[model samples]
Each structure stands twice: as C-alpha cells, then as structure tokens.
Target: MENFQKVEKIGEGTYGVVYKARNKLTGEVVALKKIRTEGVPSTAIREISLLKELNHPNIVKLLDVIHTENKLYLVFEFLHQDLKKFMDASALTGIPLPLIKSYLFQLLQGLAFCHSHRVLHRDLKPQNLLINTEGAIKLADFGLARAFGVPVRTYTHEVVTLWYRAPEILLGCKYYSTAVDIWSLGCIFAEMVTRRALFPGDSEIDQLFRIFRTLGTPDEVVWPGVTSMPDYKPSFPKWARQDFSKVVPPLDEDGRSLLSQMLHYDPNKRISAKAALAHPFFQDVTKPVPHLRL
Candidate 1:
C-alpha cells in the first residue's frame, strides 16, 4: 500500500531531513520524514501510537510508515509550509481578522480532538503547525506529545523546551493536564493577533519573569492553590496585571475575552479547547472546508 516513486530533499525537520515525494502508483504527492534511529527512540513509538489512532481535518495526515533496519520513513500529506512562515508573510501583507479567526478555530478543533483523546500536544508552537494550499491549518510534530490519561511524572520537564512552557510546568509540576496546551494556545492566539511574540522570553527563568510581568505574579488571590504549588518561589517579586486592551489593541472584545480564558492564570481555571470553540469570538465563524480535495 506504500512506496515512494521519487523523493527530493525539501528541507529539514527536528528528527531528520524531510522530503517532497510522490507515490509511484497513485501519483499522490507527499512529504516524507526520514528518522535515522538506533531503533531506540521512545519518541518514535509514542508519536506513531498517537498518530495512528488520531485522525482529523485539522491534523496532518500520516499516509503510512516504512521501517527498515536502521531507520524509519514516515509518509505524510505534503503541506505548503508552517504557521511561522505564514506569520512572517503576514507581517508584510497583514492577515485579515476573519482569516485569523479561522486559523484559531481550526487549531482548536485539532487540539480539541487531541484533548478528547486524552493526548496532550505538549509541543504546540507555530513551527509545529502546518498550512495547506487550500488554507487549512493542520497540527504536526507529535514527537513531544504523550498518549495517556495520566502521564507518569517520569518524564522530567521538557528537554530544550522554550517559551511555551505553561506556568505550572515552569513551576515544575510533576504531571500534565490538558490545561498546558491551552496556555500554549493562548500564547499562539496573541501572537497571531499581534504579529510578534507576546512574551518572547529567551530562556526558562526569563520566560517565567516575562510571563509574571505580563500577567502579573499569580498568588492565592488570583490563582487559588498557586501558593501551594511545589515550585512557588516567594522570592519572585509581585507584579501588576497589564490591561489586555493595551497589550493587544488590535483584538476585538470577544477575541480578548477568549484569549484571557485560554491564558488563565490557573490551569484548572483555563478554558478547554471545546469551550473555546464555542466562545463568542468564534460564534460568528463557521467551519472551514471539511474536505480539501486539492
């Protein structure tokens, strides 16, 4: 059911060199991922498991897998590019509000599906999100995702992790809840509206302080049980919450409301993807083309 007719190096991915390819028989175009593993990477198994079970219009399609002695080949439906590049382009042309809403809704649909399956898309950065020629947004890069109801706190904080770290995670929470993705989603939401990073803290503690300064330091008043968090540092200086209107002046009232829900201080208080889908910001929006034939 799977064999590539030809493959040309399109670019590189985190795990390996990616290819623009075609299926010999059907003439179907694809993006191929080549992972040269010692056959020991746990990520390979975890990602395959999740991708195999999950399927949705907002998520990337995995055609099939080709396993050899020393490597693994992943056949994927080709995408035009990632959101980072799209935002870079939008910087010049500027994205319309309606289109941004469409992108946000599509992202939530995919994340909602993942959350429904109890799988957390631990890494949900712009680079990990893909765009198709038909203007569809697809979530990709599941190598860092975990497929479990209650992930064993075994995996320490993400290795080489960056800005998207949720407050709980940055504060060193042992386990993950679906809320983590919402935090990242909230950040992505702001970035789409602002055309630049909302809190581009270069490193971990820097990110912590940046978020603290932006949202203001969370305490028992703002975030109940926050003081009880294992990593709560009393030494962290308290800061005032900046007005959302002043920060992202371009976003409308409903948009700002949804963003605040996603970026809620307490993980437990953060909005779910499904709920976000029904938020007033998206009430006027309808679904995108369900079947992207092209």
Candidate 2:
C-alpha cells in the first residue's frame, strides 16, 4: 500500500475503478484498478490469470498486485487514454488513414497473440483499447475473456457489450471462437473511419436488427445452418448487405474488402487476425514494432 502514491481517479466503470498513480521511489507512472467485492469475483480471477500468461507488445502489461485486508489492486502500465477518447478528441477532423492503419495493425498483432494462445478477448470496444503517446493501441479489460481449446462446451450468452457484439453471440450462439473478436475488429475498423459505431443498438434486438440491416439478412444461402440456431426466426425483414463505400467514403477498395472479409456471415470464413495483417490495406503501413516495456 505504501509503495506508490495515488495521483487521481482516471476511470470508473462496470469492471473496476481505475486510478493514475506514481511509483514514489522510481517516479514511474502506472494505472491502478481497485477491486473490492464481498466474495471472490470470477472477473478478477480471469483477468489476472490470463494477463499474467500473456506477454505481448500490444497487450497492456499487468505490473503488480497489491493485497489489503479487504480490497485488491492491480498495477498496470499507464497509457494516456483509450481509443474512444482519442477518437473523440479528433472527432471533428477524423483520424488520418495512415494512423488508423498503424493502430489497426497493432490491434491485429495483439489479437493474433491471444488467439494463438487459445485465449479469447470476448469484450472488445474502443474504450477497452488503450492508446499510448506513441500512437500505439493495446487491448485491455479482460473481465469477460475465456481460454478455449480445452473442450467444446456452451459458454454464456451475455459476454460482449451490445454495440460491438457479434451477430452469432447476439443470436444466442454460446459456442463462439476467435472469429468473434474478428467481428469486433471489423466494427472497430469502421468506427475509426467515421468516429461512430458501425452498428449502434439500444437493446439486444435493436442490435441484431442494426447488424442485419447493414450486413444483409442471413438465410441458408448466406450462413449455412444458421436457421438451426436458437434465436433464428423467419419473421426477420429481408435486406441485402449495403455497399461500404457509400457509407464510409474515407475507406479505399482494399480497406472495404478487408473489413467485409473480417465480418463474414459465416464465422468459419472470417479472416484471422494473422491473415488480416497480410491484407493489402496494410501493405505500405510501417509497423511501430515491439512496443516499450517497462
């Protein structure tokens, strides 16, 4: 408790209350997430367990754990703010193409590491993506994550947030995989271009309809065996996928193609994070490789 000085409260949300602090002796800047619960929380356990096993440039590093009589603290590498705030600050002018490309590349690299390790970042949104001063983005907030490959079992339905939630998950599909994160990456990519959510929804049903309207109403022709899903219904209004260039004019031909590929109707066909790195959209982008670790 005496190792550092709490600077100020930086964030408060569903997961944990975050604080920006300074290491008294070393003057090192770091973030502290306060976790106080009546009993043991599975959210805290999963984040701590998975993040400790994950060591990557684009993944926020969990530095130390502090234990008090009744409360818990997780020390983490401090970044300036999240991608949401970053984009909000630049809302008027919008993020530059090259900068967006660079950030997306880093996002893919981090996700690739997670998927390769058989872990799933079930929660992905702009706020969960922290951006450093060097314009690098790292994945954070693993409260809802799961490590797969052990067995094929039914997970939970209430995993991701409504806005960036994948269609399969929204339609009561509990058996999801890495492609779920790919769906989020597609949404994040589009949001970066327009500074708005691609499929913003007020509720679960609104979200499903929002996605369906944009990505076309799915049928047996589009998604094989999709009708057998627990939530599928024929009453859904039929609509074909809209053209991306008409909506997000800033994106180029390659960018449009890549985004759709990641948001493929079938999870099996969705582009992998590793494969997205090789897409032509990032051909000329210079990767700010191997982020600083302290």
Candidate 3:
C-alpha cells in the first residue's frame, strides 16, 4: 500500500471506497479499490479467482492485488466515466446510432469471451460498463459475478439487476446457463439505443409483464420447460404479432431487427453473442477496426 499514491476518492462502490491513483514508477493512472475484508476474506479470494481467469478488452483489467493489516486492495486501470454517467451528462437524449452499434458490438465480443470461459457477469448494468477517454466501454464490477454450469447443478437465482433479469430467472428458474447473460446483453442493447430502460418495471411480476407486453409471453412449445418455473403464472393478453415500432419507437429497421433477435422471448431461440457480432447492424456501421490502442 505504501508504494501507491492515492489521488482522489472516486466513489463508494458496492463493497468499499474507490480511489483514483497513479503508480509511482509507471506513472499510470489506476483505480484503487480499498475493501474491508476483516471478517470476509472470501471477498478478496472470490474477486481474485474470477479476475485472474477472465481476460478481454471489454472487461476491466485487474492489474494488481495487495494484502496488508487484514485488508485487501485491488488495482485497476482508470476509466473516465461509466455508461450511466455518460448518458446522464450528454446533452442528447439518446446515443447516436453509429456509436450505439459500436458499443453493442464490442459488448457482445466481450460477453462471448466470458461465456467461452464459463464466467457469468450476474450483475450487468450501465453503471457497471466503464467508458474510457476514447469512448470505448469496458465491463466492470465482477464482485457479484461467478462461474457456473455443471450438469444437474443448482446455483443461486438471486443475481442480476432487476431490469436485466431474464423471465425464466424472474420466474425462479434455477437451471439457467449462459442464456441469462445473453438476456442481459439484450437489455443493455436496448438501453444503449433508447437512452432509457426498455423494461423498467417496479416489481418482478411487473418486469415480466412489461417484457411480455412487448414480446408476448412464452409458451411451452417455444420455451420447452418455461411453464414449470417456480414463479410462473398467468398474465395479460398477448399481442397478435410483434409490434417493433411500438416497442422500440425510434430504432430503424436494422436496429429493430437486431434488438428483436437479442430480446427473443425464448432463450433457446435468442441470438448468441458471437452470431450477433456478424449481424448486418455491425457489419455495415462499424469501422474496419474500432480502435487500435487503449
């Protein structure tokens, strides 16, 4: 800890206070996460175990970890803003289409990398997406994230931001897979494009109905075992057909198409993150290389 110079307090994170700091030798700006682990050393262990294994450009970088005096501190690269912060500060109500496409593409690439490694970012929200000086996004906040997916296993359903929670999980499905992450990416995509939450419901049932109102409820044929979920119940009437214009008012054809695929009612039919990268939305709008250097 003595080797680092703390510049300013960034903010109060979920676990502890974060500080802006610079390395004495490298002269590099970084985030110093000072966590109180007096009784919960498992926080440090869990964080290290997840960060050490997950590496991708879109994900935040964990440069170093230190332990002293029964406390744990994590070091990370500095980011100028989070997605929510940027959106709040921007004069424009919604992000430009080109930038939105870029962000969504990069996010999918990052998520694809995570799924490939079996890590799940249980809590994915705009606040957790860090934006750098170059306007690029990096996924952060892995403290609530975990690695799962073994056959005949049951993991906690007590994860994910309420808005981004999948219907299955909201209905108390325990046997979720990477499909949960894909559902979140779908929500994030819509939020980025609309500059507002696509489904901002007050309660679990409201959230589910909000989604169903847009995409309609899932049937057993579409989602094989959805009706059997713990919290499954009847809801409002269904739309005769998809009303893309009503759901995503300002999005163009390509954007609406992409959103529909990602936000599919059936997890089984939802577009994979990798396949989403190849969609026309990214192919036509993105530059040859989004960026060469950080």
Candidate 4:
C-alpha cells in the first residue's frame, strides 16, 4: 500500500472506495480499493480468494492485496472505462454486426476461462465489464461471484442481476452449475446486438413472460420440473410463440442460431461457454489480427 500513489478517486465500490493509483515500483496505473470494515467483510474475502486463483486476459487482473487492522485493500489493473460508459459515450444503440460479434466472442472466451476453472461469475452486467484502451472488454466485480463445485448446499437465489439471471435460478433452483453464467452471456449478447434489454421485466412473472415472448415459453418438455420450484406459479395465457428472427432483426443466421441456443429455456440444453466460443459467428474472430487486437 505504501508503494502506490493515489491519483484520483474512482467510485464507491461494493465494499469500498476505488481509486486510480500508480505503483511506485513499476510506475503502472492500477485501481486501488479500500474496503471499510463492518464485521468480517466477507465480500472482500470472497474477492481475494476468487481472484488469487483465477487468471485470464479478459478478466480484470488482481495485482495485490493488503490487510490492515480492520480494513482491506485490493489492487487491480486500471481500466479507463466500463461497458456502460462506452455504450453511453458512443451513443451506441444497436451495435454493428462485426463489433457485436467481436464483443460476444471476447465475452464468451472470458466466460469459458471462468467455467474451466469452476468459478461462477454471478454478477455479470454491462456495468461490471471493464474496457481498456484497446477497446478490449474484461469481466469485473466478483462481489456476488463464488466457486461452485462442492457438495450441494443451500445458497441464495439472489445471485445474478435480474436481467442476466437464468430461468432455473429465477425459478428458485439453488443447486445450479456454470450454466448460470452461460445464461448471462446470452442476455448480454442480446443486449449488445439490440442496444436494449431483451427481458426487462418488473416482476418474476413478467420476467418469465418477457423471456417467453422473445424466445418462446418453456414447457415440461423443454424444462422439466420447472413448475415445482419454490416460486413456481403460472403466467396467464400459459405460453406463447415468439419469432427470434423478427426480434433480432440485425443478427445474421449464425448469430441468431447461437443466440437461440444461448437463450434456450432449459439450462441443461443451453450452450456451454466453450461451445459458444466455437460457434460460427466466431470463425472470423479466430483470425490472428482480430484475436490479437481484441
């Protein structure tokens, strides 16, 4: 902590105030977070434990950690802006095809890395994705994230942001896996393409209807036992059919196909992050120049 100079205050984070700092030793700009102590500060502990074991280019890099008598400080790579800021600055309503493909590919790549390591990024949203100087996007904010691979344990269903949450979790299914992250990637993908939220519902019932209206409603065949969850209840009119092509008018065939797979009602049938990375929309993304630059 003594080796860094606080350049400016960034913002109030989940557990602390984030500052843009410069390392005295390396002269590198970094984000320094000072978490206030109020009890044990479990959020700080989760972030440290999660980041120390995780490493990926598209994920925010945790540089250092310092613990004092009561407060905790976390150091991270400096990002000039986040996805929300970028979208606002550019007035980017309806992302262009190539850029949309690029962002989704990068997001899936990062998510694949997380899933491979058995980590769950529970709070993925536009605000949580940071953008560097090169327009590269990296997932940030592990406050609600957790590592999930041990024996079943009752956990909170209130994990992901409502817009990015999976149907299973939203339906009160607690024992879920990495598929939750994939569901978020799907929602983010739609947002990138449309520049508007795909399922912006005010209530749980409305949320299910919003999803159903865009991707078609779930049946027992598509998602078995969905009706048995703690929040299980019927939406009026039962189910309805929605045309994906009309909803995502700008997306190409490959793009729509991948999006459909991602928005699949059943978590079990939803495309994996790795498979999404290999989808046809990313074939051009595999080119050296694009991959290296993005």
Candidate 5:
C-alpha cells in the first residue's frame, strides 16, 4: 500500500472511501479504495471474488488488493467520469446518436459477460457506469451484485436505485434475476437519448406509479405473478401504455423497439443483455475506441 500515494479524495462508497492515487514506482494513476473492517465486509468479499474471476474490456479492472492491520485497499484502473456526469456535461450540445449507440453497446457487452458468469448486478444506473475521454463505457461499482442460478433464492427488494429500479423490484418481488439489470439498462438507454431520467421517482410508491403511468398497469396476462407480490396494490391508478417514440423521440424505430423489450413489465420477458447486444439498433454502430485519453 505504501507504493501508492493518494492524490485526492474521489468519493465515498457504501463500505469504503475512494481516492485517486499514483503509484510511486511507476507513476501510474489508479483508483484506491480503502475499506475499514473488523473482517472484510460481505460486499467487499463478493466484489473482490467476482472481479478476480471476471475479466472483460467493458468491465472495470481490479489491479491489486492490499491488506494492512485493520484495512483493505483495492487498487483499480482509474476512470475520469461516470456516465451521469458525462451526460450532464453534454446536456446542451446533446450526445451524438452513434456515441449513444456505442455506449449502450459497450454497457450490454459488460452486462452480457456478467450474466454469462451467472452474476447479477443488482444496482445498475448511470452513476455506476464509468466513461472515459475516448467514449468507452465500463460497468463499475459491483457492491450490490451477486451470483444467481437454478433454484433461485429470495433477494432483498432494496437493491437498485429508485429511478432505474424495475417494477418487479418496486412491487417487492424478492426472486429477481439478471432481468433486473436489463430494466436498469433500459432506463439508462432512455436517459442517454433524452438527456434526463426516464423515471425520476422520489419514493417507492412514486417510482411504481411513474413506471405504471409510462408502461401502463400490468395485469395477470402481462405479468402472471405480479399481483401476488408483497407490495402490489389492488386499486392502483389505471393508465394506458405509453408510446416509446413519445418518451424517446431521438431514437429510431429499431432503437425504440429494443428499449421497449428491455423495459418490459415481466422480468421473465425482459430482454437479456446478450440478446440486446444483437438487436438491430446496434447493428450500424462501430466499436468504441479501445484506448482512452485524459
């Protein structure tokens, strides 16, 4: 740990403080996360374990781990900005369609890798997606991720951020899978097109209502076990399904169609990341730059 010198405080995560650091010997910059724990927190352990096994171009790289007397420091490849901040900066000028397509494709590629490994990124939002100067997007912040497979177990409903959270999660379904991440990607996809959040709900109820008002109320035919969820309301306001073109006017027919599949009411029916990658929306988009500057 002494080989690296902290440059500046970047931000605080759920279980640790993050800093931009420089390697004393090599002069290379990196993200240093210092975790204070009696024993390594379960979240930290899971993150380290998963990162060690999964390596992909679109996923953040974990460079090293250092253990001291009472702290654990994780070294990661540094990224300058997250997608949220990146979009905020380009709000007026507007991000080009090709760039948006490139970003979304990269996001899905990373997610496809995770899902292929049986991992579910429970928390996925623009803030957790890192972006570099060359316009490469990488998935970051896997603190809420977990592995899932056959004989699915119940998970906490308090996983994803409110705006990007799936309706099934909002309705208190505990047995969610990779589909949850797809829902988040859908919200993010729309945000990239519109330069704003698709659903900016202030509370759980508000979030559900916002989603319902956009996609309309789901019933047994659409989502079989939806009404059986713990938090499902019997008399929620009835709303007709909204047209995707109206919400995401910048997108073409193929792009809107792909987004609609991802934001499906039924988690089982939601498009998988791998499937989304093959959608026609990304067919003409070129690969993002491999090397980023700044």
Candidate 6:
C-alpha cells in the first residue's frame, strides 16, 4: 500500500470503489480497488481467483493484490476509459466501421480465451469493456463471471443484463453455456454500430418482447425445450423476423451473418467465440498488413 500514491477516484460500484494510482517506485499508472474485508464480497474473491489464472493481451491485467487494515486492494493496469464512456462521449453517429471491426475482433479474442478456459463471463456489456488511448480494447469486470465445467451443474438464470441476455436464460433455463456470453457480444456489437441500445427493455417481460420483436418469437421447433423453461411464456405476440441490414445499416453481409449466429434463439445453434473469431467478417481484419518501403 505504501508503494502506490492515490491519484483520483475513477469508479464506484456495489463491490468497492476504484482509484487511479501511481506506483511510487516504477511510476506506472494503475487502477486500485479497495475491498472491505468484513463480509468479503464473493465477486472480489471470484475476480481475484480467476484473474490470477487468466492472462491475455485482450484481457485487463491484474497486477497485484495487497491486504491491510481489514481491506484488500487490487492493482490493475490502468485504462483510460470504458466502452460505455467512449460511446457516450462520441458523436451521435457512432463508431466508424473499421474501428468497430477491430474492437469486436478484440472482444471475441478475449472471450475466446475465457471460453477456452471453461470460464463464463456472465455479465458482459459496454460498461465492462475498457478502452485505452491507443484504441486497444480489453475486457474487464469479472464480478459476475464463473467457471463452468460441470455438465450437470444448474446455474441461476438471473445473471447477465436483461437487454444482452440470451433468450434461453431469460426464459429461465438453468443449464447454459458459453453461448450466453456470445449473445451479449452480439448486443454490444449492434450497439457499437448503431450508437444506441438495440433492446432497451424497462422490465423482464419488456426485455423478452423487445428481443422477440426484433428476431421474431421463437417456437419449440426452432428452439428445442424453450417451452419447458421455468419462465417460459406462450402468449407473446408473434412477430416476423426482422432484416439484419435494417437493424444495423452499416454492417456488411458477413458482419450481419455473424451477428445473426451470435444472437440465435437456440444456445446450441449460437456461434462460439472461437468460431466467431474465424468468421469471414474478420478475414480482412486479421490479415497481416504489408510493410511500406521508405
């Protein structure tokens, strides 16, 4: 604790307050989160445990952790802003196509790494994604994340944010997988392209309807066992599937295709992060650039 000088308060949440700090010795900027030791938050424990094992360029780095005075301080590599802050401050027109592609690709890369490790980022939204001045984006906030390797495990359905949650989960499915995270990525991708939330539902029912209105109401034929979920509703208004181009006007064919796959009603049919990384939409993005001769 004596090695770092507190700079300013960066954020506050249910778990703890985060501060911008500078290392006294190395002078490197870092984000410090102070967690109370009394009734220590499960999120803090989960975050610390997971971060200690996971390391990737696209994921925020957890530098160190210290305990003192009935409190724990977590040190993380400092990032300038979160995706939500950047998007909110940008012009109403939204992020450009090239930058959107780059950001989405990086997001998928990070998500791929987590999924490969059998970890589920239960909560994923723009607010949890950090962005640096160099235009590099990294996934942050592991408060709602959990490891899921047990085939018979039953997870709580009330996890991800309503708007970005997969239909299966929203319908109260207890058994889910990495497909839930992919669904949130799809919502984030649309929000980045449109500069607005695709489905800003005010309530749980509203949230389900908003998604149904956009993608059309799913039947058991298209989504097996959907009717058997705890919260399944059969009275939703039937809506025709909407055209993807109209929803995200700037997206190319490949981009729209990938988005559709990610937002599929059936978790089994939803594309995986690794598969999304290899999609045609990212071909040009992943291609190596030619060196220019001086």
Model 2 over residues 58-83: C-alpha lDDT tens digits? 99887876656567678888887788
Which prediction has the highest lDDT against the true structure? 5
> How would you encode candidate 3's per-residue C-alpha lDDT over 163-246 as one tens digit per residue?
887887788876666777778878887777667788888777788888877776777766787777788765545544458887
Candidate ranking under TM-score, highest first, comes to 5, 2, 1, 6, 4, 3
- Compose the digit string of candidate 1's lDDT tens values, residues 1-294: 246755678766555677888888788898887754366465555567557657889888777766677777777878877888878877865667777888899999998998888768776788878887666898885433452222332233323446676999878878879898889878888888888888788777888999999899999887898887788889999899999998787799999999999998888889999999999898787534322222
lDDT of each: 0.77, 0.79, 0.72, 0.72, 0.80, 0.78
The positional error of residue 150 in candidate 5, measured at the CA in angstroms, is: 23
Ranking of all candidate structures by their lDDT, best first: 5, 2, 6, 1, 3, 4
Clashing pairs in 2: none
**Best-fitting candidate, measured by TM-score?**
5
Clashing pairs in 5: none
RMSD of each: 4.8, 5.2, 5.4, 5.1, 4.7, 6.0
Cα distance off (Å), candidate 3, residue 96: 1.1
Task: lDDT for model 3, please.
Answer: 0.72
Which candidate model has the greater lDDT, 4 or 5? 5
Reference-based lDDT, residue 95, model 3: 69
What TM-score should be assigned to candidate 4? 0.83
Q: Which of candidates 2 and 4 is the stronger one according to TM-score?
A: 2
